[model samples]
Target: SGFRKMAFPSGKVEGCMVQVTCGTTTLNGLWLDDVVYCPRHVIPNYEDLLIRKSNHNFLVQAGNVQLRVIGHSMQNCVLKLKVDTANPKTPKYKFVRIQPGQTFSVLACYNGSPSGVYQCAMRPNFTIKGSFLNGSCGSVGFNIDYDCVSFCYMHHMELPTGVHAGTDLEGNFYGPFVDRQTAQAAGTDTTITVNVLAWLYAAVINGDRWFLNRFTTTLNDFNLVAMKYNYEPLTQDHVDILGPLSAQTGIAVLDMCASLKELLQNGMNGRTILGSALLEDEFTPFDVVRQCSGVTF
Candidate 1:
């Protein structure tokens, strides 16, 4: 039982959806909507952002996330490393020695693709001095180009059948997806759509509605619709299962709608746009899970 911490996108979202993939053991088999086993509960909330303490409460959203395990391994334990996205017939990594109880960084290449929101288990097979392998993944992920996109395509799963809840990089995330012509015609139109989806997804996970205010002009502003339509009304199935408490426990859809109106009207172009309300200090995953009285993960 190795315990450690792995962060997605390194720094802040900057309003974009970011993911980090690492370790074959902890990273294996987590899917979208599946509860990430945050046993230590280290992910900090942007608002109520707190550090993981042995005494603090640990809770997190179970939906709208994806995970992957790279490298070769025996069951839950992976050795050496793991290929994040697409994989070639053979492995293309160096055999490096990682100290026990250590971690390293990995590159979060934009790959010109939207596979940014990656995650893994706490204990990794390889660690450089117990840190990260490519600590530059976050910085690099911010500026990936067409070449980067092509590089990652090799590791991506060909069939879309894994623990993934949905994909923004594989281009199956949101509806009204912009085609190449449409994207080019609008001058980075696809990029804009991807950015919006990232913000929306964050809102759900963090249980914050303020992001909507900065991204849209009205609550019903269809112009800024979510690319992952399922996160919308469809997630209602879970809410319905939760029964009457849905209104009491679930994240407020109306609040998100309101925030959307505020965004379209005000414009969310700067760092200050999405406030700290989304941070853990200000919110909790329990609100999203409260509706289900008897449902246990």
Candidate 2:
């Protein structure tokens, strides 16, 4: 009914450093002008905000949802290489600067997923030759953001896996999950059985990593004892793990599942397998997951 903090970004705005050059000459070296002459960097900084002169591009963690640093670069010229290796006796160590772009560019998600992201490093001096051309320095698209991808989905259900601790021996868990689709009759029912899993990617950022690890280590002890005694403490073990999650009941899902069962355990004999469905949509009602409104005034 109400809203809450978004799981991904920390939402704190700040500026990033910028360096410009006019053909071998840095336009005032590490300047932050707001116009064709002055400007500021307005963006979100989660952590690891590297602002050292030696450290070129800042360090950041976007998201599974993809945090961004949209820097729009507009130039009147183009880009090329400055090969200084010709001086064989000069002890050449090949270098390239953002010479005359001789062109323009946008924030190239240098290391993104193509799906999109950018974990890249570049140093272009962009040499200026003919006196008719101007130097290269673009404008800040102004907007920036980054995060370590925080997630988990527990707004409704309880157990990490819907197969309840009690009735698993009977196996009637296939009952809201069956007819979730129409027409093609090929909904998620064919694939996932018990949905609802808890996830907290980079919990270190959420300040929940140690808290979670404490309990997970607790889970570790119980499981260890069970294995050591040659017994199964599955029920209470589930409690130790799932209970820790109930405290922070709104976190993450699949393609991203990281748990003991998914890791090595025989989750179910054969009655409830990991689902045969192939395509990614087979598991993604996440569109519904991402948007938390049913639309009513």
Q: Which candidate is the best by TM-score?
A: 1
lDDT of 2: 0.21
Against the true structure, what is each candidate's TM-score?
A: 0.23, 0.17
Off by over 4 Å in 1: 1-188, 191-251, 268-297
How well is each residue in 1-297 modelled by candidate 1, as lDDT tens digits? 111122223222222222333222121122112111111111223123222221112211112433243222221111111224332112122222321121122233331123334322112111111112222222111112221221110111111122111112222212221212122111111112212333343444445433533332232343335333311221333223334322553435444445544554455555342353221111112222322222322
How far is 181's C-alpha from truth in model 1 (Å)? 20
Write candidate 2's Cα lDDT for 77-177 as tens digits.
Answer: 21111221121122111111221111111121111211111111111121111111111122111111122111100011112222211001111111122
TM-score between candidate 1 and the true structure: 0.23
Stretches of candidate 2 above 4 Å error?
A: 1-7, 10-14, 17-196, 199-241, 244-297
lDDT of 1: 0.26
